[PDB]
Amino acid sequence: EELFNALPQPLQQLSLALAGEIPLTDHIFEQAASTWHVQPRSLTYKLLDHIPFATPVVVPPSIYHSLDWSKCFAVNQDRVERIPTIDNPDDVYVPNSDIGPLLTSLHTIPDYGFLHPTIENDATTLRAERARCASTFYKIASSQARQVKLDPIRMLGFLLLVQARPRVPSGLVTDQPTRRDPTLSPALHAIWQVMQYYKVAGVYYAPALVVPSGAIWWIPPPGKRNVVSVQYLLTDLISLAILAHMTDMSPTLELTGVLMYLRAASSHSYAYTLLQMKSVFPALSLRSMYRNKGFGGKAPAIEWTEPRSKYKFRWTGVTQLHDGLRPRSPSMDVPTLETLAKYELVDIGHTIIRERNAHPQHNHDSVRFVRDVMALTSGMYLVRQPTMSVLREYSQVPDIKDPIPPSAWTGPIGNVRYLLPSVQGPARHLYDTWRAAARQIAQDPQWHDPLNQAIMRAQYVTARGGSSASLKFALKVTGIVLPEYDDSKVKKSSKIYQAAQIARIAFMLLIAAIHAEVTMGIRNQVQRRARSIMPLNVIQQAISAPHTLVANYINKHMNLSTTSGSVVTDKVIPLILYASTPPNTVVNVDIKACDASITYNYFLSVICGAMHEGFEVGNADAAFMGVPSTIVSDRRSPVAPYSRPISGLQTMVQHLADLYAAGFRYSVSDAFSSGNKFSFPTSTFPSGSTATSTEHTANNSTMMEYFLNVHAPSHVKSASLKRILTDMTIQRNYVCQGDDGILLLPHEAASKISADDMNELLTCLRDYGQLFGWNYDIDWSDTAEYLKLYALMGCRIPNTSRHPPVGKEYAAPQTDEIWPSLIDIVIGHHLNGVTDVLNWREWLRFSWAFACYSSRGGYTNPRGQSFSAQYPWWTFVYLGIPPILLPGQTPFIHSCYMPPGDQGMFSILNGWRDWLISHASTTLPPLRHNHPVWGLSDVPSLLSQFGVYAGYHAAQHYRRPKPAPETASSDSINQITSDLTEYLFYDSALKARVMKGRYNWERLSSSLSLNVGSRVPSLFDVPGKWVAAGRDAEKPPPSSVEDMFTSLNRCIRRPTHSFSRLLELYLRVHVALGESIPLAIDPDVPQVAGADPANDDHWFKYTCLGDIPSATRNYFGESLFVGRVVSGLDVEAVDATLLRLKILGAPPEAFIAVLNGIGMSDSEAHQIAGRISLANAQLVQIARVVHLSIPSSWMTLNTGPYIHHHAYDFKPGITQPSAKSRDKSIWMSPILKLLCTSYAMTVAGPVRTSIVTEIDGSAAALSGNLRVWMRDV
Amino acid sequence: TGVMTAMRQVKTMTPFYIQHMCPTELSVLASVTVTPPFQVPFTRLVQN
Amino acid sequence: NQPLPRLTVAPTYDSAMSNWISTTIAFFIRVVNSVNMTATVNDLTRRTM
Amino acid sequence: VLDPTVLTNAITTISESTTQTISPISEILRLLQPMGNDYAAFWKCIASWAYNGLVTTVLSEDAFPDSSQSITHLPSMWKCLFLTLAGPMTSDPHSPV
Amino acid sequence: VLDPTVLTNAITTISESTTQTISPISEILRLLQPMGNDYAAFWKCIASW
Amino acid sequence: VLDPTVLTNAITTISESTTQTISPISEILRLLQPMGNDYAAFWKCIASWAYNGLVTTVLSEDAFPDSSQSITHLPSMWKCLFLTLAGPMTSDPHSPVKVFMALANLLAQPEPIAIGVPGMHQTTPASQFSHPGVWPPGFLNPQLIN
Amino acid sequence: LATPMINNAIRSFLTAWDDIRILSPDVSSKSLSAYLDSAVANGPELII
Amino acid sequence: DSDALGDSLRPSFETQFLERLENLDPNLLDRAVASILSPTSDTSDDAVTTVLDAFNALYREIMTPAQRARLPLLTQQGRVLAFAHSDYELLSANIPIQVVRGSIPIDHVVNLLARRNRVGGTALQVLLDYCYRTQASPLAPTPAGRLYKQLFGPWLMVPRLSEPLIKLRLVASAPAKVLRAAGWTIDGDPPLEVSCLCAYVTDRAAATALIERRLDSRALVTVGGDQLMFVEYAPPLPLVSIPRTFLLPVTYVVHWVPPQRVLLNGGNVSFTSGLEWTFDD
């Protein structure tokens, strides 16, 4: 095309690669990456002008008609700068005004400009109503432009680079030339129509150019203005132009989306208008599909596994659809078109409904219509003021329609009161569930165990990054010397700086004076560069310890989360698919603002009274975690008040009632508004704290249980619905996690329920939360939504708008990163386009374009003015992205489900190996010696020519600057580390375990004589793990970055042209693929939306394997052989330590030395070591000792039976008998079967039966050589 | 023999289902489908 | 029960506990070596139980 | 005066009302649910005795457990328990049957 | 309610040595799960009588 | 003084060929070890003997083997050993009929008997025999079992 | 070359899906709506 | 005062509570006076629960947003003693203030009958008595005399103290550059200071160990466009932070230490400054 002609010649040379015409050598990857950086970014929009094209979209000139920002911002109490709401009381986001007068010119680039420094100077010195008002708007408006990964200026550049040349047709017959043209896309046309305003000489100035410090805005010419809505409009169009070519969207559906963004840019406060229509497109398609007459298709017949608490699921065939299976629920059409009439977008509604009625049945084409319209929702991360993010949404107090009377409480027992039995509303079932769950902890002897107490203190440090240092406030009652620890360079956050100083002072001399106003929010100073964040003090989390534990007991028997890395893809996804099936219709119960719905006015007074009566069981004279027993003042009896001894477990509830009733002191110290700073209480829990938000899960199942059994079977007026509500049970019909959860209807009258009966149910359920202030976000759209994931007739609907192609959440005004951390954002950006299925070739074409810009880095040092790096092309191959073309074969045969690592590099060097031996037997001299896996052909010289070894070591090399102070100098290192060691080692019994562990292991390191100085995860790695997890967020010095930078170029250019000693041993194994395995599902049934036969690669994998993970003998390791660890030690690193020693034939003292290292008792270390075995272990868990693992891209598949009994260690008629793993097939076959699947999932097309053909050595030679490797590790 | 004897010893409701529940179930559902059951006498192993 | 001893004690098998414990194991050595477990469980892993 | 707190103190002690215990108890927690119009169903059932033959206070349709549930289902037998006690209160002559 | 966890677990919990060329445990699952993934074919037989 | 290393060292020093698929050494130490101490529950089981009028310690229903697995299923059998050993410790009056039934459940295919009133079959999962009327006649008189 | 071999497995993919076609043959939902939902829908008008 | 914040609005909160109850029902008010003042209380699900939700709809409409406007009067002065009718408005309107839950050993329910000539009469005084009681969070009411021993306790020392005490105060000094930005006619090159909080010592030498060191708390001073002027501390200062030989008042308002040095106020500009205890003469 003429678009390809307009590209630069090195940039043309990479579009030939992305099309698949030529292999992508490293020289094309270097020159074109250098072409991106030296190019002015404004030249990218000139390339959009080089396409002559037309489509019916007109960008109005009414976008540029702006408001005045100073009319939109003012000052209120405590001298805070904020946005007064103009129209509606949630008008809080960025107003669309000119950034023009607020910016000065920039010294380096005269065309752009940052903030005028007179406004920057005085607003930190003198708090004005103009300058402080200006810097609030500027830093917020720059932040919403900063919400991208890199510039959308370049993200449009990769998309035009992919669309320059069409992809070449591979020999796989399921590919198609794409139906989409760039000429027909109104997304690209609206960007060109906007950019006609932004040129003065045909140069196309971008309105912003987001430097990694922050966005820098374009200066306006005289007569024209630069409003802030355009850069946000451009980002949303580029976010839509990328996805629509990846979702293969119709051009009549982009225009449906584009006209909403142009309407919101025409309106004022663009992000607020875009927020009010955040649920239009799912309501027009996903929430309402099949309400018409003609309905049919095929649906999965998923059955609940009849032991109900197991939460297991099995795909048990197909279900042909009919008009009794279409949703009885009313359509969401009438409430949605009224919302579109508020913004004059009623033609957007009638466009979808005309196209939705073209899909009467449930097919592959129908679910693609759902995800195409769900791609039209903007996934733009809205940023308001972090002051105003808390001043409104963390300020809403609930409305209790039925408050508890004061006569319903007993006399006080210290601070707390008990609930009288005379009141029997839903508060009683709240009071009686939290009481009996509190009884099962004073009985439970899991505590007063030194390892269990060490896990809980590890749980507060590791899980969240912490907020403040209120021990500077907690010197008010106890004289502390207060070490500032500037002689240790460590960050002063709540992770390390608090808990190390806690090891000196006991809790009882501290818990009486914990109540602080700068409890949380900012690092012990009222102005910094950080945002006000959620977690609180570690000793006020320690006084909140029983409230976590009683909430854990409620969620134990109901919510078997099992604390696994695969719990969304094992439990949530099949429940999503078991819901929305034509047998059962569901009510996806959501509880909005649940964190701001738990107060001491109703909830926290009941549970603290329930825990205190619940902890009355057991010993009243018993300490707990260092809090002793104490005297309470009983006032229940009016005639006999007295002093009672209460336990330490009841002592914590006395201080917790004082802390919950005073509230939670959020202190806002954001760096966005110029110096607004105030701490204030709230009744709002922290949001992301999973150890605290499990209390919301503890109330979600509990309050639904009183609804389904007592409240609604008595309150509802429908006599027919009382028959349904009789046998509903939350152990069968309700699943919760967090605030949201699925309600299930009983299988007898599930799909045959009247919608008039369901509307009377949900009216009573919405009125049921009015007794608590719980605003239920009930939906009745006959679709599933458990944790922000969707379904339609048992087809998973990947929300493409949830993971944006351009967007990225930044809670900081800066990115706070050195350059090569962008590469780890690339791989996460790639796999989100693989999980949420897209056009897998075009997404892989887009990924190599997007990764090519992330290959060069330039550092600015005042000492050294020049730094330039270059990762090779093969770096991204090791990290997970499959290559589009190898030299010597056809393109787009490597699947996106390829593993990363050595496991992925094995897969490419297997099918491409036959070319590598033949192409190196010619054109290269043979080896002087002999090589085991390639013979006399000089393949590792040829692999050195393509830079295979270059990108291999460049990917394995680290990409984050290590800190500069070490222990070899005269630095005082162990000031804060050894005090944190004293925090973890409180009891002398647990210290006697770990000193026994390292003494026995270092005795058995040399006596057993296999390793020396090898890393074994002891508990002394955990202060090394914690303190190094504090300096990773600290900005590194330029001495550390350049040392990290120079180590990159030394790692790339070094002559080590060998792989690791596992991949050198993997390449002996030659696997080969026979016919395709017989089918798991019927491919007429859509498993995941987007996996049609057009998107062929994702279509076979969900058809050959299936998306319901079959719980087998293996079940991909939900068990991890150590049920509880100190948080900081990876159990992945523990099973890869014990099972090696089981293979190596270690004495049982070697196991006990490892288990005493992690803190297990001597009674426990024997009892784990005999329990672990090589046969009782699982086939995935055996392969993890050789660093082979299931990738994240396989987690949504049913890899269970395929690794079990389709992958061959030994297919007896086909293979050669040199690969007989005799007496080693207990542990070599999990390696051999998983290397079979490592290559089966790499080849495109259907999943073939994989067979080990031969090993170049013996299989005994490989079992010997991995045994040499397992001794070295 | 270990696999095959284990399959005998599986506790499954489908033998109980086939003569207790589903002849009641198939009787009731034959009165509610739009076409009555067109039935022919089944034969246990008789030639003619 | 029996009254409390005042000399040095040692684990003895004359108890009703040891009567109960030894006869369960004497019963489940019979169940493991029965005919039903013989047809399914392998003979070498039956010796292990 | 009609105050259930003498019963409610006597019945909340011996009850459990925990998530593994709601499925037997839940019928009599509906008994303890204090939402009521000062117990108008009682005094309306007395007043129908004087105007018997012009209005009879029959037992409701939702009073009766369905005649397919067995007696082993525990909320269904409390639902029969609350019916036998409220049997002779009604002026329905077919109430003994 | 048909649950393939029942019949698969009874098969996979029988002891075979991992020295054998053909394991009939891991073999009949290739006759058990594939092409038998549609278990509603059972219900098409009950309606066919 | 409890010290579970002895019974661990007594079991892990029995000999087993590692070539098998199922390890009776390893699949029972899975069913043996609590993660915490969890050994005061023995002392609560003793302390309930002074209080058998108020409370009767019941065998934990999640520790019964299910009515799905056979006697060939290996961890289901070692549960029935652990029930039969811990039978006389728990003070529930229906402890031995639960001990007797948990094996009679587990071999309902090879060895059938007659179970009391109807509605309670041999594959009833051994926890619903908590009433004296549903003790089987063979348990009262073993002569009734052939 | 793997490119015909990847084009050979698509034959074994379709003939397994042509195998599942002959086992459970698809039938139109216009008939399924007729044999289930047209019974509750339409009948003759007797009373007039 | 607690009653004064309901009097802050141009229609009084008790006058709207007349107008809110009268428009709905006169009969439920005739039996809510008998159920609140009952010796034993029934469920009363017709009388009082129609009053309370009408109270809370009236309360959430005006009182919680007005309390947010009353945030600088209740925490931002030098030292205040706010009074509240309940635990709600100190927490629901999210104002930074320590709440203590008081109970004096006088039966307050007969004081509302003992007082007369109110705007709603003695009948309205007992309905919204019960409204604030249900509104208050259920927690142990500590004896309020234990609060008054901190406040008014050591002010009973000074009649039996034979020595006439001296005066101390805090300093949050302000530069002239921030006090000439929006316009203030201020004579002088040394920085203008302000008295954040005063305290009294019975001698001079017991403060000499403390007048030397500065205090480790940042104090931002909001100066209004009018004569009003408000002080806030970046780090809240623990009451226990002052030594045991300080007599600080019950409540204290902020004033410039020279009033005569300030002229031509003309706008509201705040500033941040440290704290140093000093001698006031």
PDB file of N, CA, C and O in Angstrom, chain A residues 999-1023:
ATOM      1  N   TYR A 999      22.467 -25.770  61.001  1.00  0.00           N
ATOM      2  CA  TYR A 999      23.613 -26.537  61.474  1.00  0.00           C
ATOM      3  C   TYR A 999      23.620 -27.934  60.874  1.00  0.00           C
ATOM      4  O   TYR A 999      24.684 -28.471  60.548  1.00  0.00           O
ATOM      5  N   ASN A1000      22.443 -28.537  60.717  1.00  0.00           N
ATOM      6  CA  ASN A1000      22.372 -29.876  60.151  1.00  0.00           C
ATOM      7  C   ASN A1000      22.548 -29.866  58.642  1.00  0.00           C
ATOM      8  O   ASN A1000      23.113 -30.813  58.086  1.00  0.00           O
ATOM      9  N   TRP A1001      22.078 -28.815  57.964  1.00  0.00           N
ATOM     10  CA  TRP A1001      22.196 -28.776  56.511  1.00  0.00           C
ATOM     11  C   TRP A1001      23.628 -28.497  56.076  1.00  0.00           C
ATOM     12  O   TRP A1001      24.133 -29.136  55.147  1.00  0.00           O
ATOM     13  N   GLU A1002      24.298 -27.547  56.734  1.00  0.00           N
ATOM     14  CA  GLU A1002      25.691 -27.267  56.407  1.00  0.00           C
ATOM     15  C   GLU A1002      26.621 -28.376  56.873  1.00  0.00           C
ATOM     16  O   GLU A1002      27.751 -28.468  56.383  1.00  0.00           O
ATOM     17  N   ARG A1003      26.176 -29.211  57.811  1.00  0.00           N
ATOM     18  CA  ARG A1003      26.878 -30.459  58.077  1.00  0.00           C
ATOM     19  C   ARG A1003      26.653 -31.454  56.946  1.00  0.00           C
ATOM     20  O   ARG A1003      27.593 -32.122  56.502  1.00  0.00           O
ATOM     21  N   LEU A1004      25.420 -31.551  56.455  1.00  0.00           N
ATOM     22  CA  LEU A1004      25.077 -32.464  55.374  1.00  0.00           C
ATOM     23  C   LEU A1004      25.301 -31.872  53.991  1.00  0.00           C
ATOM     24  O   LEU A1004      25.021 -32.543  52.996  1.00  0.00           O
ATOM     25  N   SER A1005      25.772 -30.630  53.895  1.00  0.00           N
ATOM     26  CA  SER A1005      26.156 -30.115  52.587  1.00  0.00           C
ATOM     27  C   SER A1005      27.488 -30.704  52.143  1.00  0.00           C
ATOM     28  O   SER A1005      27.676 -31.007  50.960  1.00  0.00           O
ATOM     29  N   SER A1006      28.412 -30.887  53.083  1.00  0.00           N
ATOM     30  CA  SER A1006      29.739 -31.405  52.786  1.00  0.00           C
ATOM     31  C   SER A1006      29.882 -32.896  53.054  1.00  0.00           C
ATOM     32  O   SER A1006      30.651 -33.564  52.356  1.00  0.00           O
ATOM     33  N   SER A1007      29.168 -33.432  54.047  1.00  0.00           N
ATOM     34  CA  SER A1007      29.266 -34.858  54.348  1.00  0.00           C
ATOM     35  C   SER A1007      28.571 -35.693  53.282  1.00  0.00           C
ATOM     36  O   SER A1007      29.124 -36.685  52.795  1.00  0.00           O
ATOM     37  N   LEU A1008      27.350 -35.306  52.910  1.00  0.00           N
ATOM     38  CA  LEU A1008      26.657 -35.971  51.814  1.00  0.00           C
ATOM     39  C   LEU A1008      27.287 -35.629  50.470  1.00  0.00           C
ATOM     40  O   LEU A1008      27.134 -36.400  49.515  1.00  0.00           O
ATOM     41  N   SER A1009      27.987 -34.491  50.397  1.00  0.00           N
ATOM     42  CA  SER A1009      28.952 -34.154  49.344  1.00  0.00           C
ATOM     43  C   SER A1009      28.300 -34.063  47.962  1.00  0.00           C
ATOM     44  O   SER A1009      28.637 -34.801  47.034  1.00  0.00           O
ATOM     45  N   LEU A1010      27.354 -33.136  47.836  1.00  0.00           N
ATOM     46  CA  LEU A1010      26.737 -32.909  46.535  1.00  0.00           C
ATOM     47  C   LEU A1010      26.734 -31.432  46.153  1.00  0.00           C
ATOM     48  O   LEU A1010      26.823 -31.101  44.967  1.00  0.00           O
ATOM     49  N   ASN A1011      26.659 -30.537  47.137  1.00  0.00           N
ATOM     50  CA  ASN A1011      26.664 -29.104  46.868  1.00  0.00           C
ATOM     51  C   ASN A1011      27.531 -28.381  47.889  1.00  0.00           C
ATOM     52  O   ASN A1011      28.000 -28.966  48.869  1.00  0.00           O
ATOM     53  N   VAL A1012      27.740 -27.090  47.644  1.00  0.00           N
ATOM     54  CA  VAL A1012      28.432 -26.215  48.587  1.00  0.00           C
ATOM     55  C   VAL A1012      27.862 -24.806  48.450  1.00  0.00           C
ATOM     56  O   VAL A1012      27.765 -24.260  47.345  1.00  0.00           O
ATOM     57  N   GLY A1013      27.426 -24.242  49.578  1.00  0.00           N
ATOM     58  CA  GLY A1013      26.882 -22.897  49.606  1.00  0.00           C
ATOM     59  C   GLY A1013      25.590 -22.702  48.848  1.00  0.00           C
ATOM     60  O   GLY A1013      25.271 -21.569  48.477  1.00  0.00           O
ATOM     61  N   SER A1014      24.837 -23.772  48.606  1.00  0.00           N
ATOM     62  CA  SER A1014      23.639 -23.686  47.783  1.00  0.00           C
ATOM     63  C   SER A1014      22.499 -23.014  48.539  1.00  0.00           C
ATOM     64  O   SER A1014      22.390 -23.109  49.765  1.00  0.00           O
ATOM     65  N   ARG A1015      21.644 -22.326  47.789  1.00  0.00           N
ATOM     66  CA  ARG A1015      20.534 -21.586  48.377  1.00  0.00           C
ATOM     67  C   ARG A1015      19.419 -22.547  48.762  1.00  0.00           C
ATOM     68  O   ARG A1015      18.829 -23.207  47.901  1.00  0.00           O
ATOM     69  N   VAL A1016      19.140 -22.630  50.059  1.00  0.00           N
ATOM     70  CA  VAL A1016      18.045 -23.424  50.599  1.00  0.00           C
ATOM     71  C   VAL A1016      17.170 -22.481  51.413  1.00  0.00           C
ATOM     72  O   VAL A1016      17.695 -21.728  52.236  1.00  0.00           O
ATOM     73  N   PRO A1017      15.843 -22.468  51.206  1.00  0.00           N
ATOM     74  CA  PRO A1017      15.007 -21.419  51.811  1.00  0.00           C
ATOM     75  C   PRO A1017      14.838 -21.540  53.317  1.00  0.00           C
ATOM     76  O   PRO A1017      13.834 -22.073  53.793  1.00  0.00           O
ATOM     77  N   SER A1018      15.814 -21.051  54.073  1.00  0.00           N
ATOM     78  CA  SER A1018      15.703 -20.973  55.520  1.00  0.00           C
ATOM     79  C   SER A1018      14.971 -19.692  55.922  1.00  0.00           C
ATOM     80  O   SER A1018      14.693 -18.820  55.097  1.00  0.00           O
ATOM     81  N   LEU A1019      14.659 -19.581  57.216  1.00  0.00           N
ATOM     82  CA  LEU A1019      13.987 -18.389  57.719  1.00  0.00           C
ATOM     83  C   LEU A1019      14.911 -17.194  57.890  1.00  0.00           C
ATOM     84  O   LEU A1019      14.424 -16.106  58.207  1.00  0.00           O
ATOM     85  N   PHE A1020      16.220 -17.357  57.707  1.00  0.00           N
ATOM     86  CA  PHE A1020      17.096 -16.196  57.656  1.00  0.00           C
ATOM     87  C   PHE A1020      17.140 -15.560  56.277  1.00  0.00           C
ATOM     88  O   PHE A1020      17.729 -14.485  56.124  1.00  0.00           O
ATOM     89  N   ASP A1021      16.532 -16.193  55.276  1.00  0.00           N
ATOM     90  CA  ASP A1021      16.323 -15.543  53.994  1.00  0.00           C
ATOM     91  C   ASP A1021      15.166 -14.553  54.057  1.00  0.00           C
ATOM     92  O   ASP A1021      15.089 -13.647  53.225  1.00  0.00           O
ATOM     93  N   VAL A1022      14.296 -14.685  55.052  1.00  0.00           N
ATOM     94  CA  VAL A1022      13.059 -13.910  55.137  1.00  0.00           C
ATOM     95  C   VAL A1022      13.310 -12.461  55.571  1.00  0.00           C
ATOM     96  O   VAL A1022      12.666 -11.564  55.003  1.00  0.00           O
ATOM     97  N   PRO A1023      14.206 -12.139  56.527  1.00  0.00           N
ATOM     98  CA  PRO A1023      14.615 -10.727  56.634  1.00  0.00           C
ATOM     99  C   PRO A1023      15.397 -10.243  55.428  1.00  0.00           C
ATOM    100  O   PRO A1023      15.333  -9.053  55.103  1.00  0.00           O
TER     101      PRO A1023
END
